[PDB]
Design a protein around this ligand. Sequence first.
Ligand SMILES: OC[C@H]1CNC[C@@H](O)[C@@H]1O
Ligand SMILES: OC[C@H]1CNC[C@@H](O)[C@@H]1O
Ligand SMILES: [Mg+2]
Ligand SMILES: [Mg+2]
Lengths: 716, 715
Amino acid sequence: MEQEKVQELVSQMTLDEKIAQCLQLSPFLFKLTGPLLEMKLTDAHTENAGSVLGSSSALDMIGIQEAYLKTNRLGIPLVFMADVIHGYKTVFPIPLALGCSFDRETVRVMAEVSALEATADGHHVTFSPMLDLVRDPRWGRVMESTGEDPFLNSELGKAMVDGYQGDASKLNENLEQMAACVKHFAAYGAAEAGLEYNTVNMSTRELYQNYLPAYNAAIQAGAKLVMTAFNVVDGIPATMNKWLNRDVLRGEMEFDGVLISDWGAVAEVINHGTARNPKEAAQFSMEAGVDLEMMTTCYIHELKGLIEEGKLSENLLDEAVLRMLNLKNDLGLFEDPYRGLKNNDRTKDILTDESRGKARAAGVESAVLLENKSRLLPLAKEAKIALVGPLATSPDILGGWNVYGEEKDGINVETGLREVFETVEVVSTEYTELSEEDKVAVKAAVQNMDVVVLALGEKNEWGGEAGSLATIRLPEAQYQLAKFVQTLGKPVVITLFNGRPLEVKELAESSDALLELWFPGTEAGRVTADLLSGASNPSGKLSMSFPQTTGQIPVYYNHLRTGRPQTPENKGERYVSHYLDIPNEPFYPFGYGKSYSEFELKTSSLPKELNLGESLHVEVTIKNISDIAGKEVIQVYLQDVTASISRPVKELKAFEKVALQAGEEKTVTFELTSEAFSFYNHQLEKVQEPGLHRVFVGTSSEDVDVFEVEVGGYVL
Amino acid sequence: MEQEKVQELVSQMTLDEKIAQCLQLSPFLFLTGPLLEMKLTDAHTENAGSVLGSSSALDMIGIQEAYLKTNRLGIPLVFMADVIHGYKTVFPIPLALGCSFDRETVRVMAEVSALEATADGHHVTFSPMLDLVRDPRWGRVMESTGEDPFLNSELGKAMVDGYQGDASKLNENLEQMAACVKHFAAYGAAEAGLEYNTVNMSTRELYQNYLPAYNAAIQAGAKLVMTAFNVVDGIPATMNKWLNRDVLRGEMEFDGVLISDWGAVAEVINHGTARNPKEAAQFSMEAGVDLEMMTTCYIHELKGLIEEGKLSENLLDEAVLRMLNLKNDLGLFEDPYRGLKNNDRTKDILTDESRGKARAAGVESAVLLENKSRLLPLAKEAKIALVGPLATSPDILGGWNVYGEEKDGINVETGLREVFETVEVVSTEYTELSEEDKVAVKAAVQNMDVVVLALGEKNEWGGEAGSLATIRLPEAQYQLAKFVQTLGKPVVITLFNGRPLEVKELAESSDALLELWFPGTEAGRVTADLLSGASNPSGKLSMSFPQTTGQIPVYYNHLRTGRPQTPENKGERYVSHYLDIPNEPFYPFGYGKSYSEFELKTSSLPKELNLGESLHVEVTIKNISDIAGKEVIQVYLQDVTASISRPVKELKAFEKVALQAGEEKTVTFELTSEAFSFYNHQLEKVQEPGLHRVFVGTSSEDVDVFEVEVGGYVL
Ligand SMILES: OC[C@H]1CNC[C@@H](O)[C@@H]1O
Ligand SMILES: OC[C@H]1CNC[C@@H](O)[C@@H]1O
Ligand SMILES: [Mg+2]
Ligand SMILES: [Mg+2]
């Protein structure tokens, strides 16, 4: 409807209505993803509630919205939000696995299928993408990030927004698309010691340099909402951090949508010690520009008094309400509140076979082949497989942050494998035990067969929100099982399922091959069977570093040099940055992964010199020199050798996953704009300095050729 | 000499002499870091400003003599040294001294340290180390007094006072020496405990927690400051103009010699914030570094910088004047040999009085962690199986022991045989447990009645560039403790180490556990007196002992978070917790045991206070046992609501109280309004009205709690 008619609705609402418009509730409070409050809610509140989160189906939505609209004075429908993180009913790989795809289109398609399905079940908004930079795999929520690189995260974040939303300015018309909500603003992933909800602290320069850019990229691509974070940012809970949410989010990032609090985050500023009571919480959150309080009541019980007493301007409340109605209008809810459903059952769009094929393709793009000694893999279709371990038959392959997908529709590893291989003998074991009976049964299966598929992994409940692990290891009984299997003298493939980097040194050393499938989602067992038999060829690269040991954390590829770097020419000298007991290198680095193919790359002649403000054009010719078709991820990194700030030894600035038939050769070009060469300085200005840069072209952060470009002269 | 004659000397120096006055070299050029080709000339070494690392009185005299024969103007060298926790008489490592909670014990260590060092010709000590530490992977935790800014501040002042005494009389008091505060700033926050690694935190947090101990040492009159190896907000400290000009010289009104850490001027290159030695030199001198340690950026580049007009020579004169003013503060222009030349002071080194002082530090600094069922003290006739890698190892002096010698130290066996009549020793290796060790251990335990299991680190596993990713003893030591437990006899573990360690397995496999750290020269007597009860353990933890490596960083002064774990939400899902460990460290800050038992009570406090007013806290303590001992009364404040999320507690006062059996005492603390203040969002030091809780007790966990509402007017 016209902007004038929306603006008129704000004029017409009472104070109590405007207040309750800023409240979101779970469906069970209308006629959980967070702890529950005595909310002292009344009909006056529920009947003017702004939003519902967590509806369980289309029927739930229609029932709630109809009842609500019978009894709402002005005809303002509810907006319905949901956690669709890595799929709705067709579950795709967890986002950390999608990070490892290095494939923007895989990520967009995931989001598009997610939206297709979620809009079918009544959902208008998804609480995705999660754009938190992660350097600490103790934290359970790494599974939700695409990993340790700002650039990759930025790029995949835009891909998710574009997939969920399409053209943002046509969400009133395109009703298989939905609104994206960027979370969690900001820097939540830096939780101290990987402990859930724990203190975050870094300098404002670092926040800008590495922690904000991905939210910013998603905002600038048109993400309709932003969600606040649970953590302090420089000592102030993000939810009532005026500087962060007014100066940065609304000012510098020019964000003009709805700012929804995370679950109880408005009330929690009390626990955090930056508000004495719900009256103070409310005032501070509304001053900071939080528009929508998720499942707490500080606003409804306190805004009136704050405004009547003059401690808060009612203009702040009117702008929140206006952003709330503008959203609803952007989704076309004033002309169709059921958003395509009312007369048109879309159950047919949910869990189609086409969608399953897309999830499966996502799986095989995202898995990461870490070891493959002696061309153990791919296996022949007639290989006789002993399939053993806690992930042989476990249906727990859909991953964390799976609110809507069902395990009964998922494909386990055994089922996946029997579709492809004629001879399979299974011995399932428990996640945390290794009994003598297990060992006898394992030994018999392995004696019968020719190759072992050892299926190891985490339960998904060991990560996600409030799934922090101090030691990033599998249960010891799984390391014992891999050590037992190894004594049996048959080649072993370990297929590892998990949601965070783990200490995998002992697994790599106890097996011939190691494949990291993360949690692929609905099609897990087929993803696994296709990669193992070679129908698909592994093409994923690590988006997060796999530490030598828990105590190496944080370790990441974009790290600073220090004043005493370890060089191969000072090996064994005492006075160098090193540990006494481990290497400085992570066990597996960012951008690392194997293939059944072999590639050669050649970078075209680059200029020695470049002007400031000028783009560097990087041309790369890649050939598949093997007889197996496959995909390689070309990666381009930049380093700034001398700067007014100590800059990282490398930073990814471009990537492209190139598909190549056997013998096939392609050329790809990359533009590194002058923004790629820029950084935040001491005074927090985004700057470009004359000087030397090194450009690295290759297939990991370690397997690269190096080139020198001198930037100076005049400015373009 | 008079200020005018100093100033005049600067006026009379040539440019090359001014440049070279800002160079410090090791004795061999007339090691505590890597060496460069320095391309040094006679003109360089004849005008050098300073020597570090002289190895005796004679070395120094030799060097000053030769040097003074060729220096054109008669400007003597100043000699600096690493005297960190002792010279020849070695005291406990500073982390152990932290656990003393005893200011006076720390001042004496420092006084004895100066007494000895000045005897060997040293004018300056690169002590105190005042880096806040929250990460025990870092080897240099041994050199800090631990995780608390206040305790570090307080003990930091104690050390400055002990080395220096009256700073205005260092030309007169020749048994005292200049202190150099290090490492400015925040070096201890190295990422993942990796040596020299990135440091990053918000400026507010730098002010709130990382800066105050350096500041307290500066205000107490520390004569020098040393730069740190790490970046601070992305810029190597050494060339960090903001840090060194604005904060150090401006806010902290520091007006002495700023010395670089070893090669740190040149290493800004590696850090990537200077292209080359000319850039390094220019930026370090801008930042106000007066003395380049054992690199040559200044020597080879200041001239060209100045002539080219990229640097003003006034910055150089300012650096030179500071150098001369130190020498003059130390009295070198009247006596270049600083009391040595005719008065030989060998007599003052390693005396028995000094030894008794180090033993005393030892018994003040050890921490008794477990003592199940009155195993300790042991009866002097107790028959002891003494086993393990620290049974006989002479490696008990600690890291950062440049000058002390192991032959003069007392090992655990020797200490023990002085007190106990029956001891059977079985020495094992630090990283192995052989079948043969086990047969020999089994037989000694069978013979005796109680096991003294002596476990520990070699000192080379910490100190500078002694980072461990996993904070555990060699697995063979935990195996040994497990084996001993199976033999059925009571076990005391005496643990020797320079860092917090995962000791849950050691506490569970033993009846008593005593943390000696590295006590120094008297280690074996320290151990023997505590075990026999001649001394009663009185140390408390100045650093938290994590449940596991993966808990790090864990510390008592932590923020609440938005979802704190409360007793009334246990095992609920949505609370800050780990799935596999508790939130609490294995042992907390301020924890430790005694063979006595104490009762405390706090007199009535006001419910309200004016802004700017002090809270006066009166505490009556009684020893209610038959055993004389000491307790450390500790007072914490919390700021329940503030414009910045504040820690759940912060230490603001402590006093170690000595009590005979039955004795009772009253001690009063003043908490000034500054103890109620903190750094805000805009980096202002502030006091806000509101509620504070006050906690009085004997650890961060064993406390009574009292509320005070601050507001009203300002005093
Ligand atoms: O369910 C809504 C939200 C709850 N708290 C954590 C968020 O990631 C989630 O979207
Ligand atoms: O030896 C002098 C200096 C060397 N580098 C580290 C410092 O702590 C030390 O005092
Ligand atoms: Mg540069
Ligand atoms: Mg307060």
